[PDB]
Design a protein around this ligand. Structure first.
Ligand SMILES: Nc1ncnc2c1ncn2[C@@H]1O[C@H](COP(=O)(O)OP(=O)(O)OP(=O)(O)O)[C@@H](O)[C@H]1O
Ligand SMILES: Nc1ncnc2c1ncn2[C@@H]1O[C@H](COP(=O)(O)OP(=O)(O)OP(=O)(O)O)[C@@H](O)[C@H]1O
Ligand SMILES: Nc1ncnc2c1ncn2[C@@H]1O[C@H](COP(=O)(O)OP(=O)(O)OP(=O)(O)O)[C@@H](O)[C@H]1O
Lengths: 247, 247, 247
């Protein structure tokens, strides 16, 4: 028998670290991420990130999606009255006196991205009209469950070291498939392939105590490349550009 | 035996549809609705609608109830300092330098309406003072459960095709039975008359994933008739006018 | 045997009342309180109070912690563009064009206080950077559970009639132990020393229906003494001053 040298400890640790990071997403103590990216009429982006170690349920009213808004109030396009009149019309057919069909403050389109060990069967995304009645114009007809809004399979995955680790969905607020004047709701939970649910008797505490684990982050970027440079690549958030590059 | 004609298929389907809509409220995939309607000093209305397929728990601070506010910022009555001074006084007895006892921005009265297959025993509504201490002036004395706030039986139902389908409660913010300078909390869940709870081991997932199913809707209407015309009747939200008409 | 006088009924009732109030905190129908106190650059205080009969989970983004903000908008230090540029830099290293390293609107330091029959093992407090990635600069590396953030033992209790009834934690936003440009998350639940959990099959209803029992209260005080005079002592919220007096 012979021994005359060390194993490549440094290299072995590097492999372990690479796997540690690639596989961290499976830990219940890592995060799942949901980004709502709004492409505005000046080509600037408004980014809304939700995150949680376990579960994400979010909704955004029209005035939380337009720019400027009270979270990102860095432009001015309308006086108080003009904005009021506009909203009057977006809520109720012909009920407003606005001279504006659409607002300069309104998004042109969106990209929705979920990242982490997500339960794809839980990925749910619904753009309501301004009036915020689900799948209907009417309160009693309204329905909260529509297969169309379970968008998992319609999404396009983004790969990292050949692993699907994020999923992307995009659309236009041009009224053809999605409302022109949007209200947006979404949800996603982390995958659980085992029997013991994270909302069961013993795990529900942690879920509730961290239900508001992190505030939603709002960000405003000059244009998409700026966000790629200063956000997506920087923070390790997988992202798909207009020209369809996975960054 | 004889057969020589069709049954009235079209008519039978109409009955089925009428029942489908009248009875949709019993489906766990329909909505329950909670409206907080604020009648302002100019007779305009501020409407806040909460909705969820299962459960609604909401609270609103004073600055989310007055108008203007950061959600509906379409008037201006005060400078920054004036508003600060006012609030200073509303929070702490004689702790503010305002020259204003009451704000032009504050509501005169309210109407609270729950609609859907609601669990009336869950209907809870509490107007705290500005200082937001429940049923007390003191933190340790404060109590979260008071029978007075379980308002179900005090409400007046509104009927649709002879069925009680919404319930209304009203009051004045004149300090006599309700605080002049209000903070408002309410809750309501859908009725469950069967054994298997929607927060049990198997149903809790759906409850949590849709906890923020829909954003609260904020709306501002010229006066009550405008809202009747452009909102209540339009959206099939049952409503009771000042003159007590069920619309 | 002899009887010739009454017991001291009035006095006995007083003892019972004193105990009633001292012990109310153990009732599930009392409140637990969480105060985030921000000491600003002008020595004014911004107070954020969260409260709930059972459970508190909260997070605050940078723009909900600075002053002025959309909840307390009673000062003006920057134009829209200046503020945007500042935030650009706080989010992304060298990604902003601001001439300002720090904002006049940003807090110097904080005091976090939990009060009531709190589960000290549930007390969790985390100041993230502006970029809001937990315990990391990177999305996949991010971790939601760090012992450092379970601050219970690091806190200093405040006594009332010799009973520990509130706990205080303080720190500076000077970037040395806590980020200069903070995002803040915390949680705490009421103590449960018995077997039947308040999130179990029978108790989960009440927890959820009162999840948003009370809105967060925002308050702005001239300086610490003003808050002591008009808030802390007034409302029976235990508090520790700069000079370390328990009020
Ligand atoms: N199979 C083996 N058994 C014993 N020594 C071995 C063997 N293979 C290699 N060696 C090496 O041979 C060298 C001399 O070993 P040693 O003189 O103890 O052998 P041995 O006397 O034959 O073995 P043992 O101790 O089993 O009687 C040592 O450096 C040892 O590491
Ligand atoms: N009870 C009945 N039994 C059979 N046919 C009937 C009856 N009532 C009405 N009819 C009609 O009478 C017509 C002639 O029927 P058919 O000549 O097959 O009667 P049948 O020979 O008496 O009956 P079966 O086929 O039972 O021997 C058919 O159009 C049929 O629909
Ligand atoms: N141990 C006692 N038994 C009876 N009376 C008592 C006693 N101690 C004090 N007294 C008082 O003595 C007074 C007279 O009582 P009473 O004349 O009924 O006594 P008694 O006839 O000795 O007792 P009993 O009714 O048991 O035969 C009463 O005011 C009573 O309250």
């Amino acid at each position: 028998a012979y021994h005359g040298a060390p194993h490549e400890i440094r290299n072995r640790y590097q492999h372990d670290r690479a796997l540690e990071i690639l596989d961290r997403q499976y830990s219940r103590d890592s995060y799942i991420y949901a980004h709502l990216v709004l492409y505005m009429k000046d080509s600037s982006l408004q980014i809304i990130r939700a995150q949680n170690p376990r579960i994400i349920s979010r909704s955004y009213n029209w005035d939380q999606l337009v720019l400027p808004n009270y979270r990102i109030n860095d432009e001015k396009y309308y006086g108080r009255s003009e904005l009021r009149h506009l909203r009057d019309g977006l809520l109720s057919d012909n009920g407003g006196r606005s001279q504006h069909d659409k607002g300069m403050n309104e998004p042109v389109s969106f990209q929705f991205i979920v990242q982490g060990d997500v339960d794809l069967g839980s990925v749910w995304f619904r753009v309501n009209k301004y009036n915020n009645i689900s799948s209907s114009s009417f309160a009693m007809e309204a329905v909260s469950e529509r297969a169309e809004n379970y968008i998992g399979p319609l999404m396009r995955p983004i790969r990292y070291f050949d692993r699907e680790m994020a999923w992307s969905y995009v659309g236009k607020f041009d009224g053809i498939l999605f409302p022109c004047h949007p209200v947006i709701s979404f949800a996603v939970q982390r995958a659980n392939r085992d029997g013991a649910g994270l909302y069961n008797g013993e795990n529900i505490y942690k879920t509730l105590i961290r239900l508001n684990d992190s505030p939603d982050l709002y960000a405003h970027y000059d244009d998409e490349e700026t966000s790629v440079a200063n956000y997506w690549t920087r923070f390790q958030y997988l992202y798909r550009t207009k020209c369809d590059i996975a960054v």
